[PDB]
Amino acid sequence: STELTVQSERAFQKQPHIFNNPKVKTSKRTKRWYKNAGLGFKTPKTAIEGSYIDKKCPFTGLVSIRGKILTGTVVSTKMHRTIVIRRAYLHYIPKYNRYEKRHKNVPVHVSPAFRVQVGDIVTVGQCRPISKTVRFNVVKVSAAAGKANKQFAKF
Amino acid sequence: GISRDSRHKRSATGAKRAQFRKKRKFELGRQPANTKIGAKRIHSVRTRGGNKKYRALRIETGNFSWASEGISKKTRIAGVVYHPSNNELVRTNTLTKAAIVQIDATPFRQWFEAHYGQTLGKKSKNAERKWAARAASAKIESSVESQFSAGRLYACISSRPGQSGRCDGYILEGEELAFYLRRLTAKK
Amino acid sequence: GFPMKQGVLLPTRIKLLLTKNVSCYRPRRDGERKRKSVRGAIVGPDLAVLALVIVKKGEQELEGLTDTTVPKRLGPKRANNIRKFFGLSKEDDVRDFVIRREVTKGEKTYTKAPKIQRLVTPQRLQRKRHQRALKVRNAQAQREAAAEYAQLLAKRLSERKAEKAEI
Amino acid sequence: ARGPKKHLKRLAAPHHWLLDKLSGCYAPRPSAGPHKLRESLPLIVFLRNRLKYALNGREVKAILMQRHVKVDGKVRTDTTYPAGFMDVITLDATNENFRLVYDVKGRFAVHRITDEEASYKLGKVKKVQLGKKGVPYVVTHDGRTIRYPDPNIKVNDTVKIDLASGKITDFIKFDAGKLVYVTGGRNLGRIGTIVHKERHDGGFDLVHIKDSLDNTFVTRLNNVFVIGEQGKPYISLPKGKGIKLSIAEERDRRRAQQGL
Amino acid sequence: PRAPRTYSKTYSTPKRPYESSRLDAELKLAGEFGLKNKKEIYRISFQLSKIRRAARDLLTRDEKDPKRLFEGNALIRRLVRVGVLSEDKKKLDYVLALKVEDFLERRLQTQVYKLGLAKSVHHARVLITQR
RNA sequence: UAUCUGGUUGAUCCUGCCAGUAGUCAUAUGCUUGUCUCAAAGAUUAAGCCAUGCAUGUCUAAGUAUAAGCAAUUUAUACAGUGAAACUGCGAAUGGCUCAUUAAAUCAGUUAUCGUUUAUUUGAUAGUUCCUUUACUACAUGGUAUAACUGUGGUAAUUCUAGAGCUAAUACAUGCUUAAAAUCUCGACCCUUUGGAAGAGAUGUAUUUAUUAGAUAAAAAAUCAAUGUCUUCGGACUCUUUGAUGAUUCAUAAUAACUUUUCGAAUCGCAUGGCCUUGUGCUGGCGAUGGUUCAUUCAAAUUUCUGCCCUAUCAACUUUCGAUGGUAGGAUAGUGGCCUACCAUGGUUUCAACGGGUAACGGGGAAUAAGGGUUCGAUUCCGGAGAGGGAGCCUGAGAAACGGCUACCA
RNA sequence: GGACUUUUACUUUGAAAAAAUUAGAGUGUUCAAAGCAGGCGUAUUGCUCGAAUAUAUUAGCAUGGAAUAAUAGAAUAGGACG
RNA sequence: GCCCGUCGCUAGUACCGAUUGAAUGGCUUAGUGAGGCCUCAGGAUCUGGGA
Ligand SMILES: [Mg+2]
Ligand SMILES: [Mg+2]
Ligand SMILES: [Mg+2]
Ligand SMILES: [Mg+2]
Ligand SMILES: [Mg+2]
Ligand SMILES: [Mg+2]
Ligand SMILES: [Mg+2]
Ligand SMILES: [Mg+2]
Ligand SMILES: [Mg+2]
Ligand SMILES: [Mg+2]
Ligand SMILES: [Mg+2]
Ligand SMILES: [Mg+2]
Ligand SMILES: [Mg+2]
Ligand SMILES: [Mg+2]
Ligand SMILES: [Mg+2]
Ligand SMILES: [Mg+2]
Ligand SMILES: [Mg+2]
Ligand SMILES: [Mg+2]
Ligand SMILES: [Mg+2]
Ligand SMILES: [Mg+2]
Ligand SMILES: [Mg+2]
Ligand SMILES: [Mg+2]
Ligand SMILES: [Mg+2]
Ligand SMILES: [Mg+2]
Ligand SMILES: [Mg+2]
Ligand SMILES: [Mg+2]
Ligand SMILES: [Mg+2]
Ligand SMILES: [Mg+2]
Ligand SMILES: [Mg+2]
Ligand SMILES: [Mg+2]
Ligand SMILES: [Mg+2]
Ligand SMILES: [Mg+2]
Ligand SMILES: [Mg+2]
Ligand SMILES: [Mg+2]
Ligand SMILES: [Mg+2]
Ligand SMILES: [Mg+2]
Q: Given 3-state DSSP classes, what are the helix, strand and coil percentages for chain A, each rounded to the nearest 5?
């Protein structure tokens, strides 16, 4: 989520062991570290371009992605830097030889590199426990919106 | 004692979870070192599977790194000036990681002048060689030359004294020193 | 019969909490503490006995004490302890100055001496010799296989400069 | 449950051991060592249940305690000692040398091998890294740490080992079309060649396989163990060369072999 | 903590308890092969019905299907062995047919009589049970 | 292995229940009871209470023996066989029992540790230890202080122990050491250059911190600050070195330092031999116990996906006194609201949240045999929890242990 | 190796998979419930077959299918290839 | 012929109900707070700042 400021904490935000010697006059000021998390997900240039710190960024942080790769429609974007998707699925009741709609709300951390709004389909990746509940991380946005700029005013 | 389990703690739904089994020694936790200044005093602590941990309580010197200079010295820790987590740490001069402290300066003086031959603030043979081999590399920095006047340099604790019994850190600089500076005074 | 316990003061009894290495307690399991009672270190009329120890002998022999004198059961057993009970310099050879105890077996009078420990002997020196030797022997060994591998990589870069000189 | 479990209930014992249901109620729990529990064969089982050489286990003790038996060269006195796949059991009396090796049904066979083939073992480097002081090393599936291997040598390749001295004499890369011995699955004990390898980044590489009967199947790459060329295996394979016949096929060969 | 000792019953019991006609048929069977109780019949017809089950089941799977060939022949060959099944009807819709007496005619109780040696299905019993 | 039958009416056809009927690895009880084999069994009720006895102890040639122990013989005047006791070591964290609590907990199948600890076994692994560095530091081996025992005692009482006198080590506590080499900093002198030099120290591993290396997405140029190797003194730099993963700040290495400095054998058994300048010099066989780091094996801890019975006469739940998330720290073996501080207002819910019930441990399974189902699983295997109820903790690799301790309650 | 991929459901095949239990093959425990044995000789110095197979499903993984059933796309062109 | 209710008897079950009725079990505010662990002190004694 973030946006603005970047240095808006009591603590000074920075990447661990990414030194910039002030002696050596530079044109970019702060050297930045990023990675390619693998598994075929482009690390959006807005991770490389950006300035946000986020130690839970799968591209500019110390989290690593491995295990389950899931997708769900974004259903809530109200928590700073983490959203809550709703993965739905039909479940088989064998006495009746029919299915019923269930669902789950997996809470996942989202890196500033992505901007997400509610409704977007997302693709998440499992990582270490990052909080009390989040065990996944936003790793690709699939949708865009919902054809929103084609819902405008009059002729 | 303390238990780092999560099996208390309401469920994300908010439900109250029952008691299932008693506290296990491996999900335990111990108390804080609340390490402070002065007179070295440390207590080893038997952790899981052999393995000592070293609880510092009272430390007075520590190893500190001039980052843009690639050296290190141990110096007296003058005390604490800032702490992002808790103000009471600053007031009790408690040493923890990410603490902001002041250190003895002079050993970083003694080195600099003996390495650059320039003296901060305000004649041998091959010595002259070296001192003149360097510089154009001696420029230091406005706000880091400054602190030397006071004989007290600002440095961030990087070690975890509660764990290692060490109290090590790096002198503040650049963008980072700029941060704590602004903070330090617009509250002073 | 509760024992006194030095440095607890009080002329009364209290219940302490004792550990390994302490008076009035022989633990029964590695790191066990039992909570027991204890009489204080302050002499009172509630005692049955004082344990006392002479420090200066006055003017009159006390029959069963001064008048008589029992010996010490055992003699020195370690190397230098012998040397130090007699005063010898690491020279005078312990093996004669060890202490021999006679005993009779009906009509066989026997003689039995200790077993000096930490005694410097040929066998020890031999092991000391082998220590230092094997430490160095493998040292050089490791250096050998070392440079043996540097070759493997060195005439592999001549195999990658005859491969890159082919095409 | 407060600590390492030290017993094995016969019933929970690995089945490819072929221990009878009754006559007790424990089995031997394999010791700690070179191969995993669920995939070894303790000296007590091989010396008593295969070899029929001791009756009691008490006897298996008395046999071993005479240093008779030696595994992979070294002597091995432990009753329960975990003996695994490719190892070399050698009775110093009797002149007998065995290489532990799989059936087709999926168990270890009693496989008599030559006095001099027994002087070297085969082993799959499960990993290679960089050790202390910059020294590289490989580690085989029996926990052999072998410093200074070949640069070409890397995981899933199998290796020829001297046993005499610790070191490696040869190796075989994991190529399409190399001899392969399936060490696990319901294709455990089968043998042959390798068609191709399905990749799958994230986990579990598949290994398409055919043998000397134009028969195919697939196992996890973990369950695959390179062992030579089509035809040419670097070790003596046991009878039936791990080929796997139909139940009806096997029913015929056993009821073709009939005339006394 | 030891293994399970496994067991099974060897007999079923008649649904209706009192089919006057089934009892007729049964007691006939008894006194004709010298059996002591209805269980000796309950026993057989039970194992008889499981056989017929397996058969039934197999005769659904494809002709020349793997199972019904392996387990097909196995059943046939075992039956023919002990001499219940007839050599001609050697393809398992007779196993589907079959019937109880067929099994009855092969007890050693009965053979001991059938070829001389007893002259009574009961003398048969006594002799056999008397070593 | 796809079956019904009696009972409503004066008679009739339906509805429909009651009854009959059959099995139960399903308890009991009654009556009766001869042979083989097989063999469950204080679960249900009271995870109610328990007399007494037993259920955890353990020694190799190979840590410790002056038993004032036995044996004497067979070489042993330091020791030697055998060996009580006691020290030291290791195990007692397995096993066995029970099903009390427990309903998204356990448990199952399926994942994760690029999120950790790991006795042991197995494989690998240590020339670096001292000091201003000629009148040297025990290395041919440095320190005491204890049990056992001896003796003096106390109490109704216990696997109670006191005062005194001894004496061991693989207990406790110390502390020597070994090749060459290179690279770094200093640098006395000399002499002006384009600049070089005696010789001085630092440099095992581990710990803590900071900075670098760890390339590769196909090819090339100029210049700044330093400054590498070879002159054919304008100058060139030509060959140039790279590990694994889907992925990392990985494996590994380098630089400046830090440490009440981790480890680097003061250990024990069998043999006793080479070799001369004959010093009892220098060497030297087999193998036991150890010892740091890595690996392996035994494990463990957390962990992803999906799946639980009845209940709305439970509809809103969650944040007192963390409920959802962010930053920082602390704490842990380690991730993590695990805890704290600051900050935000979140998280769940008719697709049933939350609450209640369970005569609820979960599974492999068990019973009933057209099929679809219904019911059951305390209970021989796996997992889990407990040891009268709670909490707390020592020891240790591993316990929140109960045939360990401490407290409160009963 | 680079550069990118509208979403599902269903279905086929396969991996990974505990044993005992169930189904089931082999074998004359004297029969049988069982058991995993056993069987052949030179029975004076050994020969030898065995210890199958299937099921294992809801989920997860791997893969063949492209009917049936969803979902997304170019209408203020803020389209598509170059 | 069937048949409805009050009313009377005997028996049995459930309900409502003064007793601000009673018991068991699970959570729990507040007050009080054992014990061990951590910690600041303490120094009986016992040797080299530490025990
Ligand atoms: Mg928020
Ligand atoms: Mg000794
Ligand atoms: Mg074992
Ligand atoms: Mg993986
Ligand atoms: Mg009637
Ligand atoms: Mg009538
Ligand atoms: Mg009438
Ligand atoms: Mg009925
Ligand atoms: Mg009970
Ligand atoms: Mg029971
Ligand atoms: Mg009880
Ligand atoms: Mg003796
Ligand atoms: Mg247990
Ligand atoms: Mg002392
Ligand atoms: Mg020690
Ligand atoms: Mg580069
Ligand atoms: Mg690389
Ligand atoms: Mg690292
Ligand atoms: Mg000699
Ligand atoms: Mg209700
Ligand atoms: Mg946080
Ligand atoms: Mg709120
Ligand atoms: Mg409902
Ligand atoms: Mg219950
Ligand atoms: Mg159960
Ligand atoms: Mg149940
Ligand atoms: Mg119960
Ligand atoms: Mg588990
Ligand atoms: Mg427990
Ligand atoms: Mg309570
Ligand atoms: Mg307890
Ligand atoms: Mg116990
Ligand atoms: Mg399938
Ligand atoms: Mg089977
Ligand atoms: Mg009242
Ligand atoms: Mg504290």
A: 5, 30, 65
| Residue D253 within a domain | no
Strand order in the sheet with D88-91: D69-71, D88-91, D97-99
Question: How many angstroms separate the CA of C17 from the C1' of H34?
Answer: 15
Å between E99 CA and nearest CA of chain D: 29
Technique employed here was X-ray
- Tell me, yes or no, whether D42 and D141 share the same domain: no
Rounded CA-CA distance B35/B99 in Å is 12
Q: Looking at domain B106-151, which CATH architecture does it have?
A: Orthogonal Bundle (1.10)
* Cβ pair D11:E70 closer than 8 A: no
Distance CA C163, CA C148 (A): 22
Q: Are residues D182 and D166 in the same domain?
A: no
C153 contacts on D by Cβ (under 8 Å)? 151
Chain C residues with CB under 8 Å of D134 CB are none
- When divided into structural domains, chain D yields a total of 3
CATH number, domain C72-167: 1.20.5.2650
Separation in Å: F197 C1' and B126 CA: 11
Domain boundaries, chain B: 1-30, 31-105+152-188, 106-151
Q: Which structural domain range is residue D127 located in? A: 121-171
Q: Do B137 and A23 touch (CB under 8 A)?
A: yes
Rounded to whole angstroms, the Cα distance separating A69 from A59 reads 16
What distance in Å separates the CA atoms of residue B11 and residue A133, rounded to the nearest whole number?
9
C5 burial (CB, 10 Å; 0-12 / 13-18 / 19+) is buried
Whose CA is closest to A124, among A137, A134, A112?
A: A137
Per the CB < 8 A criterion, the answer to whether D19 and D25 are in contact is: no
Query: Could you tell me if residue D159 is inside a domain?
Result: yes
Residue D182 lies in a domain: yes
Interface of D with C (CB under 8 A): 147-148, 150-151
The resolution in angstroms reads 3.2
β D179-182/D168-172 pair status = unpaired
